[PDB]
Design an enzyme around this catalytic site. Sequence first.
Site, PDB file in Angstrom:
ATOM      1  CG  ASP A 159      -1.859   1.140   1.299  1.00 19.49           C
ATOM      2  OD1 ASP A 159      -2.125   1.842   0.287  1.00 19.49           O
ATOM      3  OD2 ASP A 159      -2.296   1.387   2.438  1.00 19.49           O
ATOM      4  NE  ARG A 209      -1.905  11.777   6.697  1.00 14.77           N
ATOM      5  CZ  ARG A 209      -2.729  10.954   6.054  1.00 14.77           C
ATOM      6  NH1 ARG A 209      -3.760  11.406   5.351  1.00 14.77           N
ATOM      7  NH2 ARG A 209      -2.524   9.642   6.127  1.00 14.77           N
ATOM      8  CG  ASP A 211      -2.550   6.574   7.696  1.00 13.37           C
ATOM      9  OD1 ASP A 211      -2.901   7.239   6.688  1.00 13.37           O
ATOM     10  OD2 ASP A 211      -2.694   5.328   7.830  1.00 13.37           O
ATOM     11  CE1 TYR A 258     -12.532   3.927  10.868  1.00 10.13           C
ATOM     12  CE2 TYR A 258     -10.523   4.795   9.887  1.00 10.13           C
ATOM     13  CZ  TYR A 258     -11.902   4.712   9.912  1.00 10.13           C
ATOM     14  OH  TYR A 258     -12.627   5.426   8.978  1.00 10.13           O
ATOM     15  CG  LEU A 259      -5.372   4.755  17.074  1.00 13.32           C
ATOM     16  CD1 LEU A 259      -4.678   5.551  18.175  1.00 13.32           C
ATOM     17  CD2 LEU A 259      -4.380   4.373  15.964  1.00 13.32           C
ATOM     18  CD  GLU A 283      -9.119  -2.478  16.564  1.00 13.36           C
ATOM     19  OE1 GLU A 283      -8.453  -3.293  17.249  1.00 13.36           O
ATOM     20  OE2 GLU A 283      -8.591  -1.603  15.829  1.00 13.36           O
ATOM     21  CD  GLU A 293      -6.741   9.649   6.644  1.00 13.63           C
ATOM     22  OE1 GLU A 293      -6.443   8.823   7.546  1.00 13.63           O
ATOM     23  OE2 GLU A 293      -6.889   9.354   5.430  1.00 13.63           O
TER      24      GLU A 293
HETATM   25  O1  LIG Z   1     -12.150   7.411   5.586  1.00 17.46           O
HETATM   26  C1  LIG Z   1     -11.132   8.235   5.062  1.00 17.46           C
HETATM   27  C2  LIG Z   1     -10.032   7.430   4.432  1.00 17.46           C
HETATM   28  C3  LIG Z   1      -8.955   7.067   5.129  1.00 17.46           C
HETATM   29  C4  LIG Z   1      -7.873   6.158   4.606  1.00 17.46           C
HETATM   30  N1  LIG Z   1      -6.670   6.850   4.115  1.00 17.46           N
HETATM   31  C5  LIG Z   1      -5.401   6.606   4.801  1.00 17.46           C
HETATM   32  C6  LIG Z   1      -5.181   5.219   5.413  1.00 17.46           C
HETATM   33  C7  LIG Z   1      -4.543   4.108   4.579  1.00 17.46           C
HETATM   34  C8  LIG Z   1      -3.604   3.408   5.548  1.00 17.46           C
HETATM   35  O2  LIG Z   1      -2.966   2.262   5.029  1.00 17.46           O
HETATM   36  C9  LIG Z   1      -3.764   4.516   3.329  1.00 17.46           C
HETATM   37  O3  LIG Z   1      -3.965   3.575   2.305  1.00 17.46           O
HETATM   38  C10 LIG Z   1      -4.098   5.908   2.803  1.00 17.46           C
HETATM   39  O4  LIG Z   1      -3.180   6.368   1.822  1.00 17.46           O
HETATM   40  C11 LIG Z   1      -4.156   6.886   3.969  1.00 17.46           C
HETATM   41  O5  LIG Z   1      -4.072   8.239   3.597  1.00 17.46           O
HETATM   42  C12 LIG Z   1      -8.472   5.354   3.458  1.00 17.46           C
HETATM   43  O6  LIG Z   1      -7.457   4.530   2.937  1.00 17.46           O
HETATM   44  C13 LIG Z   1      -9.041   6.299   2.401  1.00 17.46           C
HETATM   45  O7  LIG Z   1      -9.490   5.509   1.331  1.00 17.46           O
HETATM   46  C14 LIG Z   1     -10.188   7.138   2.955  1.00 17.46           C
HETATM   47  O8  LIG Z   1     -10.351   8.324   2.185  1.00 17.46           O
HETATM   48 CA   LIG Z   2      -6.549  -0.724  15.689  1.00 20.73          CA
END
Ligand SMILES: OCC1=C[C@H](N[C@H]2C[C@H](CO)[C@@H](O)[C@H](O)[C@H]2O)[C@H](O)[C@@H](O)[C@@H]1O
Ligand SMILES: [Ca+2]
Lengths: 548, 548, 548
Positions: free
Chosen positions: C58, C202, C204, C208-209, C211, C246
């Site tokens: 990814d 930033r 990422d 979702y950390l 659960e 994000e």
């Molecule tokens: O819900 C929002 C999102 C978050 C997620 N984006 C981040 C999380 C993913 C972590 O592996 C990654 O693929 C993506 O580039 C990141 O910027 C998801 O993949 C996106 O498709 C989506 O727009």
């Molecule tokens: Ca998690």
Amino acid sequence: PEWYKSAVFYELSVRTFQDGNGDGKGDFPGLTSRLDYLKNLGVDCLWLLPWFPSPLRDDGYDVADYRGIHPDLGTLDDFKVFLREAHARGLWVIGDLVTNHTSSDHPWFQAARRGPTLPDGSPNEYHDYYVWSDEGKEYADTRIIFTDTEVSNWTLDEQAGKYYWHRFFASQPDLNYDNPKVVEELHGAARFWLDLGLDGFRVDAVPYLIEREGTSCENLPETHEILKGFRAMVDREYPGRLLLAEANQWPEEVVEYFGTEAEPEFHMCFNFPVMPRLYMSLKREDTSSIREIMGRLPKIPSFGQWCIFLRNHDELTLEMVTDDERAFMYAAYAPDARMKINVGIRRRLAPLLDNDRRRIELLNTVLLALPGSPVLYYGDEIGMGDDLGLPDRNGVRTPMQWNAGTSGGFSTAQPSDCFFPPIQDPVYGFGRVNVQSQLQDPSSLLKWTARQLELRRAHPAFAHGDLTFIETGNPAILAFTRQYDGETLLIVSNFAGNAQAGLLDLAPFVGRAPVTLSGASPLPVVTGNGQYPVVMGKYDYYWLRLNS
Amino acid sequence: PEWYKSAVFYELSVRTFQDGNGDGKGDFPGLTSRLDYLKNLGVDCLWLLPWFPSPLRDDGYDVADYRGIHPDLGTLDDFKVFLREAHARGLWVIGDLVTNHTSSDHPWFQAARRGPTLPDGSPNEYHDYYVWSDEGKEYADTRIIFTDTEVSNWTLDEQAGKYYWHRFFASQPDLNYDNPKVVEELHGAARFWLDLGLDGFRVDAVPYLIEREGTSCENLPETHEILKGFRAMVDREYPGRLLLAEANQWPEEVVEYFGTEAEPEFHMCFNFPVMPRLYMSLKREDTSSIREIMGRLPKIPSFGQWCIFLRNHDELTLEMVTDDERAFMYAAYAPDARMKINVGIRRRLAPLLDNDRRRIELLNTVLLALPGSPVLYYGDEIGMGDDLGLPDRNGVRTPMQWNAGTSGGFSTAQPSDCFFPPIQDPVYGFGRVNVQSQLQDPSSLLKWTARQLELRRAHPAFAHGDLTFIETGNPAILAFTRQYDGETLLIVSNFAGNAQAGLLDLAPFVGRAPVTLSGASPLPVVTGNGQYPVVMGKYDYYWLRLNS
Amino acid sequence: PEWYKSAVFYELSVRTFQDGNGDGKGDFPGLTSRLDYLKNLGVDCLWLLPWFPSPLRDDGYDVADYRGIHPDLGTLDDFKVFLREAHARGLWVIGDLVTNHTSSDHPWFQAARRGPTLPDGSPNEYHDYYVWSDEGKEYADTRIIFTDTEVSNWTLDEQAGKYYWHRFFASQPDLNYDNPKVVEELHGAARFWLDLGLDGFRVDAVPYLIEREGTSCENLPETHEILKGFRAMVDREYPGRLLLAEANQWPEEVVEYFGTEAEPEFHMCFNFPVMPRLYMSLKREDTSSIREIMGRLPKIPSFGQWCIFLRNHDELTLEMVTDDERAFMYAAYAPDARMKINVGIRRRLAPLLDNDRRRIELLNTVLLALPGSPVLYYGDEIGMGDDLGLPDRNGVRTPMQWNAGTSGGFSTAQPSDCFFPPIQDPVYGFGRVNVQSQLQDPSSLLKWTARQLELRRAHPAFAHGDLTFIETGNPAILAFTRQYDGETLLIVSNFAGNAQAGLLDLAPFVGRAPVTLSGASPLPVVTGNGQYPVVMGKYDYYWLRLNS
Ligand SMILES: OCC1=C[C@H](N[C@H]2C[C@H](CO)[C@@H](O)[C@H](O)[C@H]2O)[C@H](O)[C@@H](O)[C@@H]1O
Ligand SMILES: [Ca+2]
Ligand SMILES: OCC1=C[C@H](N[C@H]2C[C@H](CO)[C@@H](O)[C@H](O)[C@H]2O)[C@H](O)[C@@H](O)[C@@H]1O
Ligand SMILES: OCC1=C[C@H](N[C@H]2C[C@H](CO)[C@@H](O)[C@H](O)[C@H]2O)[C@H](O)[C@@H](O)[C@@H]1O
Ligand SMILES: [Ca+2]
Ligand SMILES: [Ca+2]
Ligand SMILES: [Mg+2]
Ligand SMILES: [Mg+2]
Ligand SMILES: [Mg+2]
């Protein structure tokens, strides 16, 4: 003659010239450390932009205290040392006397805005320092100068519940020269600095002193009267000092600011009328307007001298050209709306000429050759640019560019912490345009300016001669003589970007030989009818002498 | 009505549009394969540049043979197919009739230059085909047209030992129209192409036919007579065919070239008066000159239509503007001397507007909404630039740009081998500017042009309605109506780069809603005094219908 | 205030920006060589995509070493040089911290998957780093994010013989934040880079950390708590750095990620809720969604700033919009099946708006005028397209297009050897769309974007002001004010393709005169009851100040 008549003036802004202590602001110590530079360049008198305490809403032309040194700049002690070291090197220094208005933060206005009468019923003597109206109806159809910012020359003060007058920004309320306590308040301001040894003043915005109903509120005789009185004061209490006028008006009215022999006003006034016609002619390839507008300037008093200039710290003003001339100037010189402001074009000399040294040298030689004393704007001698991302007219006020080190040598502070950012663009930024580079460069613009001023010192007819224009049969080619004390100079200049032919009316000079001032190289002797064929390369300037 | 009144014209040069066979020269087989593109653009009539045999010293405007096809362009067979295929697609075609002069290489002039009488004594009938003088002092103080090349309108022929006349290049001697045998050589030259099915002619340089002492040699009543007999001929032998005049003169002299109802001349003349005022108004943000030169145009005959145009294969012509108008345009639109030629500016439309699509679209909407029939210059519909390293006016005649392949899709030959180099600069080059690009791009200038023509076609008031200018309260906003058959269009256009406010005098239309031609979105109904307030964004064009 | 409230952010990908050594892959030497480009554009902070060692399943968001530089990008020395050169120009830099999950190639996970107990019967300290289930039936009924690839958020490890959690790809196992050793490993990753001078992160996928059973496993209080701890650590050990979140949730849940004044979390979050509604409104030509969603956002903490964006390296996410809104967006912006991926649309900005520069310019100005700090996606400032033949979301990650030479300037290797192939289609390929072209084009999108940012710099109410929506009477017109430091900006925007009229409710500002921020052109003074009529062109943006 008087000393201002042979001076080369140099305009600079202390906050922007040299930073001694690293806080990102220019200060008097830093200025003091660059006086050899200035003296070596050929400069005789320094004109410093306002240095007084100020909130700086107009870059220090909004004055909060006339008898002190803005903290950014150092102390009154630093100032006194600077002035002692300037005179040490045989330089004069004049300051900026802001007379038409003060800052709204000045104690006088803080007082004036409490109203006509004080809590205890006794009159507020400071209310009448400024100009108030209940409804702001007076002096309608009076011109607004800062048209991009002000909808009115009246603004309502929230505490006073009245309107106050301001020819400039709203935080710059006009002083009331109908009140004699105001006339004295600025004679007193003048005495403070004349006493410390200042050599004179640039006097700011002088046409707008007195407002009268039913008039333009410009050039009023009541205003000139105040200036006659300001000259009589200096003439008596401080002989030898300089009063210089900023009077951008049409030729007939400008000459009024010199006064008469019987009743003197200013010693010098900037020649605002010729300035835009230099640029127009360069574009039109036609120097008629230069010749027309100068011909409209009546003779000036004995003690009088013009101050000639290409640019300064304001915009290139289009207030006193015709509507068709103004439209031409925006089209030729401001192709971006962002380059316009308040009826003028806010750009530096080199950008205005597409950074073309041939054209820059051309206009500087007209500057040094026309009848007056020239004033260079700081940094123009190395070819500085502008930053039109800065508001108002600050894009031409960026830090001096001393070398390629941190911040252009202006400060050890980061360029983002300098009071204005030193220019860093690929064409005019300080990696390319700086004094250190141009001192080592044998052929730099800076070296060229020094040499050209040197050439001019050699020939007092530049400083003191008359001016007679010569027909050339080609509007691209401006030609004139300067005669003084036996010497006759011929100045021929091509305002075209390709080769041009002329036939000079050198009738009065038959049998004389024109010879170059530089290198003493003679031209064909004027013969016959004296109609003298010449050719010129693009933007060529011929500095010649006509033999005895 | 007549077909040329509803037509969209399109000017191209066969040598330069499309090369069929790979030798670097455009040809009629190539032009034929592109008729579908032209059809789909919305074009109705092709005007082709001169296709006759020729040494090409004025790009084929020096004609060596009025009854042939230049070998570069293919054969007369290729010509015939082209005209069949164009007609098959509903396209009209008009040629270029170079009447005023022929090439020095034409077998007429090679004969006339052998003297007034032959080597066997008999008189040389071809000599009086051209205009001669023994000393060449006649018609002096008459304007030179190609001022950068020709010092005089007389040139010595070394063999005939006399001077001949030429308003244009020295290899383009004028035809003598006092000689009625010359009038008949061109009638029969016209007859040749009309007999083959060609739908009309653009006629070249029609003001300069007859020359007479004591006159400027322009719009001479004698010249008009010859034109009247040319239209009398065509009206009789070839009804429905089109005569279009290139007459660049001031509004009052141009309308003459229509003739009157009783004595007709051309069906169409190029509206040169308004053309330079379109550009001035954009630079001054002042739409005044447009309304004034339009107002000086007297009404034209019933059969007559103006041909509206922004640019062509020639320079932007500054011949019929005032001295200050001309000097303004040089400043605003010709920063380099290279950009100048012969009292005009040799630059393509997009470079003239700094490649600002917003400006390009605006002048096009005005081109499409002024009264007349529009002509598009080839390649301006995809935004072609120019090449000012190429001599004369060739720099706006570079090959058409079809795709990003070899030589822009114009030829399989290298750019160096094309008759003119296809432009390859980073801004206008065929890698960036080409038809394949813009058929894929959903929003290209090409598709915008095709859609604006589509929108125009839907409103016949654009082609036949009258023109009433409307007061806006802002020189920057140009507003006018078009009225025809019960439709009233309202065409508001901002000529300024910033937002602009306006008050439109819709007094006549109180009670009616304006609505957009595109999208049927209504604006507030007009009420009361019908002073209709409007705001406009930069370079905005409002195309609107006034409901009934 | 804080530096990130005035910053303009710019999102780029090292592997994709500039290759400095010919191997087809972007690197830090290359990115260093492009820093003056970003500086001159007006960018302040560079957000760099993941730069860590990774198998790139990814694209580097599957991290395999949090404390190193992926060999594609060069060495850690190269990174240090880049950070020195960025800071030497006043540019901040931030990294992308992938907190929720590591690569399955991460050392920790190669260890964890050996089992709870090692071969010698002693326990495995790395097993409890990840989330394990024995049948994988926990947290059932929890959203799958990567719906086009992953069928379940539990996957069976071959070797561990158990199920591990992954909100993303199966090669990105979720880290287990109930284990406090994990929490320490990411404070420790932070410290490493924060110790080299990096200015922030930033972060990422932060919702979702943690659960928990019986929840969505989104936005849980236990997740917010770990984030408060992360803010506390940086607040104490590295004052002044930036944590940017994000979090694409619904307006209510998004604001939680700032924390409270008392328990602070992130300095900034992306304004995800508004992003789709900008696109919805442009197609519906109705801006009520923009207002409804903006108004569901509660006020944010004193330190909070929003990050506004049009597009990024991901798909245009349709996760947080209704079913009907999502179906609309698919109809309007995803005609081809190929254009969808996992609840969202994977296209660049310019393709989405059909390469219409009018619509590209409109949404860019709203981006710059909404409350927050703007982030530009690299290449969008020149109008780059996409390559939807690449898998996942890589279609928007094609190499930056610099000039029209080999590979567009991105590398000296051929396009087929570049990590992703540079676009070469007729509409968006580097032969038509590139930086050097757009530096020479006087009217390019690049220069427009630069100048629009400069306009934005000049008016701090954009960065800092509040926001009051203004009634207009026309849903196609979106009007709001920005007020700060007594400067009042009026921003009006037409979202439709034809002329639109409206009645601005400007009652709070009667007596004020609106002027364009560009040019200072005045609209009429607000009179009466402040019901102000306006007309707009298609996609017009009026950027106005209300002169007081
Ligand atoms: O819900 C929002 C999102 C978050 C997620 N984006 C981040 C999380 C993913 C972590 O592996 C990654 O693929 C993506 O580039 C990141 O910027 C998801 O993949 C996106 O498709 C989506 O727009
Ligand atoms: Ca998690
Ligand atoms: O009318 C000529 C001028 C006078 C004014 N210049 C002086 C007066 C103003 C007083 O505060 C000040 O802003 C400016 O710097 C001074 O040099 C005006 O601001 C200029 O823009 C203009 O060209
Ligand atoms: O006055 C109008 C003009 C007429 C002339 N244009 C025509 C006359 C010339 C005849 O040989 C030819 O070069 C030109 O292309 C024709 O369209 C001239 O060359 C132009 O520069 C100019 O705009
Ligand atoms: Ca006053
Ligand atoms: Ca003739
Ligand atoms: Mg200091
Ligand atoms: Mg051929
Ligand atoms: Mg590499």
